[PDB]
């Protein structure tokens, strides 16, 4: 008798700044990269 | 969060339509004003020439 966790899969849409009808709210964050490995 | 998308799309659409309509109306009214200004000078000089 053991324990395992389950979760369904979830989806997202991304839409870029459009020259037309679009005005997007800004609720984002910034970061500095640093070195990479 | 259920009203975020409708809000954002409507706001931008209204602002863009308003700016475009304002620019077009200003240009048309201003062209009408130039035409009216020429039409009045023309008529005045026509009267003067007829007198002479």
């Amino acid at each position: 008798i053991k324990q395992h966790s389950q979760q369904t899969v979830r989806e997202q849409a991304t839409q870029m700044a459009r020259p037309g009808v679009l005005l997007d709210n800004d609720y984002d964050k910034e970061v500095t990269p640093g070195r990479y490995q | 969060f259920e009203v975020e998308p409708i809000l954002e799309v409507l706001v931008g659409k209204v602002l863009e339509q308003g700016l475009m309509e304002v620019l077009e109306e200003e240009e048309l009214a201003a062209m009408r004003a130039h035409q009216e200004h020429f039409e009045q000078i023309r008529n005045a000089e026509l009267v003067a020439t007829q007198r002479m």
Side-chain angles (χ1 to χ4, degrees), chain A residues 20-25, chain B residues 4 8-9 11-13:
Chain A
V21 73
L22 187 153
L23 172 82
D24 287 324
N25 296 294
Chain B
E4 166 52 51
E8 60 84 15
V9 58
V11 163
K13 154 183 180 307

Side-chain angles (χ1 to χ4, degrees), chain A:
Chain A
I1 318 303
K2 210 166 75 172
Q3 309 296 284
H4 285 160
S5 61
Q6 169 273 347
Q7 187 184 9
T8 65
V9 76
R10 53 197 213 176
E11 64 206 21
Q12 195 174 4
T14 81
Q15 163 52 23
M16 301 195 38
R18 186 152 181 258
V21 73
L22 187 153
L23 172 82
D24 287 324
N25 296 294
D26 282 344
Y27 187 49
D28 53 356
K29 79 204 205 72
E30 187 176 2
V31 72
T32 187
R35 293 294 177 173
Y36 169 63
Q37 296 294 321

